[PDB]
């Protein structure tokens with residue numbers, strides 16, 4: 001069983017309640033969303049960063065266990081052109097759970113972003129036996145948000 | 151080439167008035183929405199098509215950003 005640890009602090013939310021049909025319809029994969037309350041996004045698993053958006057607001061990471069995750073901070077946040085985010089890690093960087101990948105300005109994003117809801121989905125759905133979504137509040141790099149098998 | 155096909159599906163290179171996207175959605179502006187080939191987008195592997203005002207959105211998945219880079223180069227070259 002693989003435990004996906006919270007990439008940021010906040011409250012878990014249903015991915016179907018995200019104001020974006022591609023995420024809500026899980027076209028980009030399945031997982032959960034998090035209403036953020038902290039100031040940084042860390043690695044939810046031990047693996048390798050794959051790609052960091054040029055606007056430094058979303059990234060891809062592959063766990064050593066073979067799971068591909070995708071973290072997207074807020075909705076339509078690319079329109080902010082990087083304002084409020086600071087890439088701390090590099091693409092291809094090997095990381096351990098909790099390593100910081102990006103730090104953000106919550107108050108500035110809460111005021112300018114259409115929504116700070118942050119989807120954390122698995123783009124590897126066809127390679128996992130089961131996805132158990134958890135509930136409640138999480139603490140960055142500490143509280144598990146999803147449990148997967150095979 | 152898929153980029154050229156995407157441009158044709160929107161109507162043509164001159165029918166594109168703007169290019170932009172996010173992580174899983176591609177936004178292409180079109181002068182006439184009646185010239186967008188919704189069926190053509192589906193065959194290109196688009197997961198779905200959404201039109202808002204004069205802006206047209208196509209769901210290519212996470213690789214949507216790849217189409218943006220290829221279309222930007224092909225449309226500018």
Ligand SMILES: O=[P-]([O-])[O-]
Nearest residue numbers: 075076172173174
């Ligand atoms: O997928 P996105 O950048 O709203």
